[PDB]
Amino acid sequence: DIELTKKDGTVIKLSEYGFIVNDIVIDSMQINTKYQDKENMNGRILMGSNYISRDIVVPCFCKVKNRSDIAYMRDMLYSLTTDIEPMYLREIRRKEELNYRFTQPTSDDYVKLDKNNFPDYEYSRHDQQIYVNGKQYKVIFNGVINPKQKGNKVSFELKFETTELPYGESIGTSLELEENKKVGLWSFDFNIDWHAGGDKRKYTFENLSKGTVYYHGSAPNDQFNMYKKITIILGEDTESFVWNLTHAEIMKIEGIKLKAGDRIVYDSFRVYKNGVEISTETNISQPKFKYGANKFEFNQTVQKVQFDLKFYYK
């Protein structure tokens, strides 16, 4: 219940700004269907079906000490939130409906009050809220009205909306999973084994014709807009270079001659032959990680493969 927003150049959270929130409700993704009805047949063909948009709603109110200040506070809200600038929203929850604790009415152990006139139930460090999950959402704002209930309390009804892709982009790459350097950004929503360096954590293999990958993301990383990015030290010289993959298509690189120690950066629908001067004419096919086991099969025992990606959720 804070509605964190990471904008291009800053980080903001509402309750820091005197802005309590009632709740956050996140719709699912609007499935746009594409059916076609045959003329006299009791059944209609599915041309397609496709996720579109994940409309968020967040009603937030605010109290202040005096009626004038309402105006300022409201303006702050707009200047703080209503941003066409695609932002990264992060949801927050509490772990408990906190109450005031027992005290002693002996002219001592009195109660605290926040900067806003409320009772601080958060006595200890471990009371305040948490990033409930290690993911974000690429988000933009839609119109709000501000009904002023009595006093200094005024409500607002934010209506956020997904920007590019209706998915729960996981923050942090898969290499931070590999190297346990960055802390946070890994919630139990992702069923992740502790065996760092073990299987289903590793995306850095060496000297293999074929290997195994566990894509922890329920949603499939077929869309190029996702940050799926591979880089391979090819290991062995060749004239052509095929690699296959399951839950995806076959990939070739024919017609250009390579060398062993040369490396390929295989970005989404894009191929850096040696990091620059992209040679992407050969078999334009992009790979697709669906969920769980995504087994790959090279053909000449690359001396290194490693690939970072982002986990996406539905």
Partner 1 sequence: GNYSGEETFEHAGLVMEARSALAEIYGDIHAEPFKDGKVTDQETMDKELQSRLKKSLKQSLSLDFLVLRESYPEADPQPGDIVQIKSTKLGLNDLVRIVQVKTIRGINNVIVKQDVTLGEFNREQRYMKKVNTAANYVSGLNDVNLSNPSKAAENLKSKVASIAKSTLDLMSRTDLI
HSE-up (13 A, CA, CB side) for residue 167:
21
Name 15's Cβ contacts closer than 8 Å, sequence gap at least 6. Answer: 1, 2, 21, 129
Nearer to partner 1, 38 or 126 (CB): 38
CA proximity to 59, closest of 12, 24, 97, 94: 24
Closest distance to partner 1 from the beta carbon of 39 (Å): 4
Determine the Cα–Cα distance for residues 141 and 143; give it in Å rounded to an integer: 7
Closest distance to partner 1 from the beta carbon of 35 (Å): 17
Kindly tell me which residue out of 10, 40, 106, 191 binds partner 1, with binding defined by CB under 8 A.
40
Radius of gyration of the chain (CA): 25
Kindly tell me which residue out of 8, 38, 105, 183 binds partner 1, with binding defined by CB under 8 A.
38
Nearer to partner 1, 39 or 97 (CB): 39
Q: Provide the token pair at 281.
A: 């004419």
Q: In b/e form, how buried is each residue of 130-163, taking b as 16+ CB within 10 angstroms?
A: ebbbbbbbbbbbeebeeeeeeebebebebebbbb
Residue 145 in contact with partner 1, rule: CB under 8 A: no
* Contact call for residues 193 and 174 (beta carbons, < 8 A): no
CA proximity to 211, closest of 155, 134, 138, 294: 294
Nearer to partner 1, 45 or 113 (CB): 45
Closest distance to partner 1 from the beta carbon of 276 (Å): 49
Residue 84 in contact with partner 1, rule: CB under 8 A: no
Pairing of strands 137-142, 270-272: unpaired
Closest distance to partner 1 from the beta carbon of 46 (Å): 18
Region of 6-14, 37-45, 48-56, 209-217 interacting with partner 1 (CB under 8 A): 37-45
Q: In b/e form, how buried is each residue of 243-253, taking b as 16+ CB within 10 angstroms?
A: bbbebbeebeb
Residue 130 CA: distances (Å) to CA of 3, 90, 119, 233: 11, 10, 20, 40
Region of 35-43, 126-134, 152-160, 211-219 interacting with partner 1 (CB under 8 A): 35-43
Nearer to partner 1, 43 or 143 (CB): 43
Closest distance to partner 1 from the beta carbon of 41 (Å): 6
- Taking the CB of residue 171, how many other CB atoms lie within 10 A of it? 21
Residue 37 in contact with partner 1, rule: CB under 8 A: no
Closest distance to partner 1 from the beta carbon of 36 (Å): 13
Region of 32-40, 166-174, 193-201, 304-312 interacting with partner 1 (CB under 8 A): 32-40
Nearer to partner 1, 41 or 276 (CB): 41
Residue 39 in contact with partner 1, rule: CB under 8 A: yes
Residue 41 in contact with partner 1, rule: CB under 8 A: yes
Q: Provide the token pair at 124.
A: 């200890």
Region of 39-47, 255-263, 268-276, 278-286 interacting with partner 1 (CB under 8 A): 39-47
CA proximity to 1, closest of 17, 24, 18: 24
Q: Provide the token pair at 76.
A: 């702050």
Using CB under 8 A, which residues numbered 196 to 255 contact partner 1?
Answer: none
Closest distance to partner 1 from the beta carbon of 40 (Å): 4
| Binding-site size, partner 1 (CB under 8 A) | 4
Using CB under 8 A, which residues numbered 92 to 111 contact partner 1?
Answer: none
Residues that bind partner 1 (CB under 8 A): 38-41
